[PDB]
Amino acid sequence: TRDQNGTWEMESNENFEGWMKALDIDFATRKIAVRLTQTLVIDQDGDNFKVKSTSTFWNYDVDFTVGVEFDEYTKSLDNRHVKALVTWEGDVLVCVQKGEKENRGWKKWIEGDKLYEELTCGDQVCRQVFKKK
Ligand SMILES: *C/C=C(\C)c1ccc(-c2ccc(N(C)C)cc2)cc1
Secondary structure (H helix, E strand, C coil), X not given: CXXXXXXXXXXXXXXXXXXXXXXXXXXXXXXXXXXXXXXXXXXXXXXXXXXEEECCCCEEEEEEECCCCEEEECCCCCCCEEEEEEEEECCEEEEEEECCCCCCEEEEEEECCEEEEEEEECCEEEEEEEEEC
């Protein structure tokens, strides 16, 4: 299923700090952020997505249309400019962010009643699982 609509509450988080390090997030921010439970809110209508990543420490929103390249500033994450593109590979939603960092992007897919997410940058992969609330 390609339907990722919903409010998703984090169940597990692996190597989040490795991913943040590959983005050069500073020590203070990483040490706090790695402790925290996350929420993902996804509003999906056809190709149009609105995605929100939230915790008690950050609130990060992005809107995109599947298949349409967009220039993006990554704002409070790491303050960089990328060219971003989100597409479908089967039922895996795949984002590639072209720029300074290699292998930068994410993937999301549904496995049952849960949302699986990969965050990638450099040689680091962070793996997360969310439950539908
Ligand atoms: C599908 C997942 C997306 C678009 C996403 C974007 C950004 C983040 C994110 C933002 C900010 C931070 N900080 C400040 C540590 C971490 C991760 C997560 C997911």
